[PDB]
Design an enzyme around this catalytic site. Structure first.
Site: not given
Lengths: 459, 459, 468, 453
Positions: C255, C289
């Site tokens: 990520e 995010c």
């Protein structure tokens, strides 16, 4: 009363109100005939207000974000435990349920409601593949709209939450119409539990009334897109006809418990199976998905199983549900006759009594019958009472025929040490559920209370 | 009378083409000129029993056949649709009174469905769900329903029979067809023969054509079928639903193309929409997934649309179906002609205004268009089955939404609006499984409908 | 200390123990340099213990009934919400988060786990169609086994939980290796919070050490069958490489939030897009995010947007983390500090226009804005991890898509345009997993990531195939 | 040449052309050393062109109607059986596969692309639930874009189509770089068959270069979103490393186990170990390089098994079951492995000659888990029979090797067998015996588009 309002009213338009009908039904404790209460039943103008208030409030509900709806549904489950004893008592009083049975029913209603709270985060539509240039095929998954649930008297709370919870968690507004005998355990309580949980006014409603006055009108109505029914098969048929004969037509989900089978194969652990069949025949009687009213046994173990099965049911105390009782009284005096009639008829058709008990008031004691054939009424027809037939299958293949010989919807059980063969045999039975050596399906539920809307977009 | 070689009067039972056994003789009449096509001895009750019986015996092995194997046979039948195109066209024109070009569209439709159906064997899967009880494992198998009874209509016989026949067979089902008494070969013999020539084993596909009522009831009422698929009229579908509920229940799927709406919103490309409405209302009538029977236009553009639309429909060649230019053929039979005749009269008596009319000679009904119609009028609230249109004015956006949901049945609907996003939201406001914006077989929906799920818990 | 256990210890075997390496770690408050705590670290030996313990305990946990694992996860959400004040204070002291930012992080952490509590009953396998007579194909969906999770210093709590919660809920045992600067918020709190919710001994762990002696071995170990990483792409690349040629078999989920583009199109609601840009760039930086490192605007509305964005950025409270109004606190450490000072200058010595800039008082970097930037200036192509924003000018709609994709970080992107139908078509051209139009944790993707499918094909002979 | 076109050329930008590398390769028939052909190798600039052209031609192919794509992919399956005999020869002479083993590969190839023809209709996206008031979440499922496929010399036709067909159907543009020893069976033939099938120009390509030249450049290229590799575990490793910005799918065949439990129809199972050890040699899904047996049926299994392998006859022939090895480097590898096997203590239960490149079956016994013969990837007819003290040992022994795409287990208790099977970390495990849904996933990516209205 219950949780803060008098259990004799109706939740219409998010307002607990008195019925405007001329009929006043008297709720009677099936055990000692004591009047529990008297309520002015609902009229059709009341059902109308129920449905119309649901329609008008449903959109805002369906549009409430997934997590919110989820949290409320989850709150309802918390409340179910937080009012457990008050609900147990009503289960005993009105449903004639046993203390242990009521306890189970509440845990069961709480598992269904617990699963159902994850439903919001599980309804998905899909983006289908296009076959024409410029076309976008999107099939949205939405709430059906307004669902009319018709709960029974067997497990009033359980079998009603089985459809109220998923239906509500998924965005629908629901209107419950309980059985005449159990209007608060099958209607007021679940209704109240969801109102207390946060379900907005109009989304959850309850309307009780005499069959001859509102029964048909509840199904034939133009507002409900879905009618969920749980009860006896002849009444299911009638609700089924009514749904397609001048409505308009609406979807009808019929939960018809019938005469469920308990098959014991030749390699089965007769010990455990005996114990098990005893639990499913009586401790779970009334529960359409776990109940069984006829055990089919292979010839090679028949005499042994029957032996152990009878010695197991003789030890099932029948008495005051308020007590260690495990089998309380029947619900109606109408329901009492029917049982009486079936016991006789089995004897008359040449069945063999294996265990007979006294019949004081509505307190019917267990009854077992060996030497039963698939053509005998006791086996063909739905029972809904502590009646139990034992049929003999002289072949494993014959067992399958015996199992399918009678109509039954919900479940079927089978015992066999050979997990693999049993699993194959299970497929040979016509039931949507078959359990080996011992419920509620969320996927099946989200699909029953949502509709797929295919929207084709040509750019 | 013949088709692909075979005698067209026979019935396919037990894998063998045989002559009917009932004394009733049915004469097939060309709807356009009353010339007799054939005269087949009808199938008796016993013949239907044989079909279902033999079908039930062959289903298991067919269902056990490897996926790739079943899919090769389904893909073959699609090629066969094309290889026999020329001859099927003649039959379509000759028996169902279809236009030559309408016939060619229908065949493209059929083949397009069975090719899509060809991929079903490898798309059917079950689940392995989580358990909540220690040592228990949930396995829900997705299997075929078993034997499926298919009743097809006279409008798009080939295409609408195939719509059920192909996926059902593909998925593992054995199927028996009972076509409309007006189109026994286009709705029964041809579909049945294509799959037989494609190699589905004997008994897995059958057609049995018989005189209405009794045989019709027997066909629905039988114990063998676990599903009865029906496409047609609502009063008849209603009846099929009744019989499926009384007289051993089975699931019943009803495809009733009632009165589908064509919604034109204020910001719609009026010229496109007008041409589109013409196409859907006359060149696609009978096909209950693409046809429309009423138009709902926003006031602000009602007159522009109406004039542009009246123009367009006045340029549609009515007449002999054999001709390549024709777009409107005869009506299937005198009775249907009577309904169309009386529907027109009634529209007038109710206050409707004639916008387009023409003479009706033989069973050749010229296109008719009415304006100033209201949702309470029957010309817009009842099934039509003929070239008759209604145009209702929508003074408001939300008003259009009301009129669109004003009729009972509806497979699809269409909306026109240049604002692609606002139109998609609008479409969601319509209670129809299918809604197309600015311009139709769902594979997934067909798999779910022709398979059955078996949950099997094991400990 | 944190909820009954001293934050300085590691959770191995199910017990909070002292480290065994000779290296001693010294926690430092990024806002003032206080010694938050000092604790011995875990050695390569402590990593083996944690993994072996997790390996043996894994199976029983996976076998626990779905609803039971679900109730445990659900409670962790409640405990997370219970110890709110304590966690808040901790986020501010160690990770150098802000009063309100820390409070947002917990909500985020909470939602994720209540969502994960739903996972046990959502995990299912399949029964595939057969092509060979008598053969049954079952494909089971099971836990990966043991999952090693490496959490970052940016949003330590929320980003560790993002993977720790779904992994546990799904039946895995997980060992956390937090960022050296945030061992407690990135490891201790989430571990302890799950322990106090009911996960078994060995199923949840937290081994903290200097990457110098623990980092590589953690990824390389033979037990973990999945490594979850969140941090800089350089380190991410090292992790990936290390996982492919060390312990032969183990997948990796990286990520990497690099430079997320915030695209304002020709027909955007410039005023709304302005306030939003402000929010994504400062209140949310660190949040993989949700943040944005660069904004690209159609020339037609460029200067209009720039003027308003600068205004809103100018009035953003910067200062003491403890304060309830602050929105931007100190950077985690000096290394990161000097990395930002270097980047502000590099942007300058590349010909970029300063729009906003403030003093850098003791690790407290005031918001920095740069306009007149192009896709090749390091400032607009490399990841930032700091309150530095760069605005680029887009000739037209088509150039916007190209500017947006000039990165190698496709984790999330935002786009503003009044026309919904077209903005959605436009969004499809951006190379990211997610794009948000005019203003986010996917549960479905999460279960796929922390489980593995096992196809089991069983052929049955006539002998043990009945009623055929 | 093949199906018309010049078999030595490289399909680039839709046109078959000659390579720009100043290196030529002489494709040599493994069986007799004869020269099938020679070709100008591809260069780095060649690869860049194949990828750059593929990228430009991709968006259009993906936007092509689903049923259209499906008819094209389906056609390729018909063309595969139409060119059957012509392809049989190529595997026979280039891959060195027997006639029975070649025919089989063509059917298998057909099946994959035929299953793949149903993929266009089965690619669905999702409309997820929303938690924020008035927001819609659409999750589109799209093609990755450009896919670099690296096929191998073992089953070059089947193992290349395995990736190629699913990736094409789904709307990806693919460039295949085949193993240096099989540039037409693993590259030209598959590319040429999809061209005839209808695949647009630049959507399908093949580039055959020298490992030292193109090898690394083919992987680290910016264009491809996915790299599908099939081969030996060591080279699969460099690939992944080099790839790390794009995702990579490694089909690393190693030493697949054939576990025979105490109640495993020792006879019929011994017949199957033979089949999975030689008949399905190159098959990275149907092959086994070792058999683990419980002590009880150990000797019982071994005898019938030895007699099984001894009966296997020994390419262009009909009876023949085993063919030659692809090259010298591989040959020396088997020999080298056979020797250190003996030097480690393994008993030569079965051993055949070594005429040329043709290696006859080899079976060893009394082998343990810490020997390269049971540890390393073999890529040859070398079998190891390990004895398991019980079943728990069988689990250990089975999971021993680092790589395994599939495994086999024979038993009689289908239920216990299944349970045991779950205790072997392997994607596939078959009991007493190509996933589409997983191929669809592999060659697509999910794009979450959230819209706040």
């Amino acid at each position: 009363t219950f949780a803060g309002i008098d259990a004799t009213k109706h939740l219409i338009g998010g307002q607990w109100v008195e019925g405007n009908s001329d009929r006043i039904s008297t709720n009677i404790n099936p055990y000692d005939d004591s009047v529990i209460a008297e309520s002015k039943q609902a009229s059709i103008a009341d059902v109308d207000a129920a449905y119309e208030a649901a329609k008008k409030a449903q959109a805002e509900w369906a549009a409430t974000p997934a997590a919110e709806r989820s949290a409320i549904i989850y709150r309802a489950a918390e409340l179910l435990e937080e009012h457990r004893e008050e609900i147990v008592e009503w289960l005993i009083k009105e449903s004639g349920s046993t203390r242990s049975k009521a306890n189970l029913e509440i845990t069961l209603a709480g598992n269904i409601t617990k699963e159902s709270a994850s439903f919001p985060g599980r309804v998905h539509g899909r983006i289908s593949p296009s076959n024409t240039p410029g076309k976008e095929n999107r099939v949205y998954r939405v709430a059906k709209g307004v669902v009319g649930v018709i709960s029974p008297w067997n497990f009033p709370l359980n079998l009603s939450i089985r459809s109220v919870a998923p239906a509500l968690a998924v965005g629908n507004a629901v209107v419950i119409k309980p059985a005449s005998d159990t209007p608060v355990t099958g209607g007021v309580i679940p209704a109240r539990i969801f109102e207390e949980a946060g379900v907005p006014a109009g989304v959850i409603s309850t309307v009780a009334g005499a069959g001859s006055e509102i029964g048909d009108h509840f199904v034939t109505h133009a507002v409900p897109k879905l009618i969920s029914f749980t009860g006896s098969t002849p009444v299911g048929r009638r609700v089924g006809e009514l749904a397609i004969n001048g409505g308009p037509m609406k979807t009808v989900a019929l939960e018809l418990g019938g005469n469920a089978p308990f098959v014991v194969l030749a390699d089965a652990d007769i010990d455990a199976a005996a114990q098990a069949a005893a639990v499913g025949a009586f401790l779970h009687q009334g529960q359409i998905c776990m109940s069984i009213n006829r055990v089919i046994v292979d010839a090679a173990v028949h005499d042994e199983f029957l032996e152990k099965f009878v010695e197991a049911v003789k030890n099932i105390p029948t008495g005051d549900p308020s007590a260690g009782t495990l089998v309380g009284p029947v619900i109606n005096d109408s329901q009492l006759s029917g049982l009486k009639e079936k016991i006789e008829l089995a004897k008359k058709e040449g069945a063999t009594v294996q265990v007979e008990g006294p019949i004081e008031g509505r307190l019917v004691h267990p009854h077992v019958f060996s030497d039963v054939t698939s053509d005998m009424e006791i086996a063909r027809e739905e029972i809904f009472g502590p009646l139990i037939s034992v049929l003999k299958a002289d072949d494993e293949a014959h067992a399958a025929e015996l199992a399918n010989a009678s109509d039954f919807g919900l479940s079927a059980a089978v015992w066999s040490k050979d997990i693999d063969r049993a699993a194959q045999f299970a497929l040979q039975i016509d039931s949507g559920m078959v359990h080996i050596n011992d419920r509620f399906n969320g996927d099946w539920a989200i699909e029953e209370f949502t509709t797929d809307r295919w929207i084709g977009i040509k750019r």
